[PDB]
């Protein structure tokens, strides 16, 4: 997450921090972002789980904010189901079908209970996306620069603009490694962008003046690199898939 603000207690309450467990009593390691799309379901990126696709390796945190008091009873979740898209594949640079679903529960078996700091995010209407050039917002704990190694301590959000496939599929962009199950987004000034460690996190667009999960941070050459937008899994083309694994 390069070049944004730090979020607060009612900014991006659907954001989910996905951590990988370490052996022993070592604290866990931050692995990916994610979005609460149902009280029991978080959507993220498959490429985040392909090395260790067993649910036992992860723990999910919700309600993150500098003004929110951590309560492990309501904000920490075990993963009782880990579903990766069955046709997830890795290409030269791009991921295909880069989407995953995590079914979550607290230590007492409950789902996420809504609050000032925890809300679900709406899925888009089928095959419906905001127009290109819309302002979408991105969020994460990822690097604040391509060159930076340090990860930030607290949640950042920024604003990018949707980029058309025609513009994105130009050779000096990404050429044929973009398909229509992806969504490109960038800063027209190329100063703000998502980065390493934002993977699986939300791309939030308005659709009918409703905040909507239009994308899942998936990939990109560099971070905030001129002529090179962030590529997102286009959620509107996966709705059947999502609602087939839930309901």
């Amino acid at each position, epitope marked *: 997450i390069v070049g944004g603000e730090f979020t607060e207690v009612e900014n991006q309450p659907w954001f989910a921090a996905i951590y990988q467990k370490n052996k*022993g*009593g070592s*604290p866990p390691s931050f692995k990916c972002g994610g979005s609460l799309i149902s009280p029991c379901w978080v959507a993220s990126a498959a490429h985040c789980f392909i090395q260790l696709p067993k649910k036992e390796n992860y723990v999910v945190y919700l309600g993150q904010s*500098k003004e929110s*008091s*951590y309560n*492990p009873g309501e904000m920490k979740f075990e993963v009782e189901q880990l579903i990766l898209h069955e046709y997830y594949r890795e290409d030269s640079l791009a991921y295909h079908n880069d989407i995953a679903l995590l079914k979550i529960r*607290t230590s007492t078996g409950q789902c996420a209970q809504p609050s000032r700091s925890i809300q679900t995010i709406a899925l888009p209407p089928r095959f419906t996306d905001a127009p290109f050039g819309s302002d979408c917002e991105i969020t994460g704990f990822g690097k604040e620069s391509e060159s930076d190694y340090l990860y930030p301590k607290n*949640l950042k959000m920024s604003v990018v603009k949707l980029v058309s496939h025609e513009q994105c599929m130009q050779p000096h962009y990404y050429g044929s490694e973009i398909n229509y199950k992806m969504l490109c987004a960038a800063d027209p000034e190329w100063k703000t962008d998502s980065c390493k460690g934002d993977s699986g996190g939300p791309l939030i667009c308005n659709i009918e003046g409703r905040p909507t999960l239009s994308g899942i941070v998936s990939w990109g050459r560099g971070c905030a690199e001129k002529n090179k937008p962030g590529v997102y899994t286009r959620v509107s083309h996966f709705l059947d898939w999502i609602q087939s694994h839930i309901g």
Partner: nanobody
Framework: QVQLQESGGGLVQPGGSLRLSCAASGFTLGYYAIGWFRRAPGKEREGVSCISSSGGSTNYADSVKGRFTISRDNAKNTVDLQMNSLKPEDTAIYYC??????????????????????????WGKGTQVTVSS
């Protein structure tokens, strides 16, 4: 092979003092926020007092304010609970619990303490504190 272990339980005269200690083995307790929780006969588990991993933040139940004092030694891998001016009402099983607080939250350990300890990762077997004539 991760273990939390309480010690210090016993039988003390009302108004007397008693110190509990929680020691860890198999891991570094210093990364973890620690809570002391107690279950009295008949009532449900309640947060007595809590402390953050660096020690900067503490929380106390209203019942024990000014009487109980939590502290820790991250060099020695321990957390202590000093209990002064003990009252019969304090008679209970005292448990030590440890939870890693992720980054991105408030500095407070208030919510960690007021919620009966649900979700705390690690728990000791508990030790007995009895206050009686």
């Amino acid at each position: 092979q991760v273990q939390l272990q309480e010690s210090g339980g016993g039988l003390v005269q009302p108004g007397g003092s008693l110190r509990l200690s929680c020691a860890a083995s198999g891991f570094t307790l210093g990364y973890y926020a620690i809570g002391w929780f107690r279950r009295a006969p008949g009532k449900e588990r309640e947060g007595v007092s809590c402390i953050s991993s660096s020690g900067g933040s503490t929380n106390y139940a209203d019942s024990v304010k000014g009487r109980f004092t939590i502290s820790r030694d991250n060099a020695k891998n321990t957390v202590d609970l000093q209990m002064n001016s003990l009252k019969p009402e304090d008679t209970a099983i005292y448990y030590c619990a440890a939870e890693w607080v992720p980054p991105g939250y408030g500095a407070t350990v208030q919510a960690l303490c007021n919620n009966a300890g649900y979700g705390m990762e690690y728990w000791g077997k508990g030790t007995q504190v009895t206050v009686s004539s």
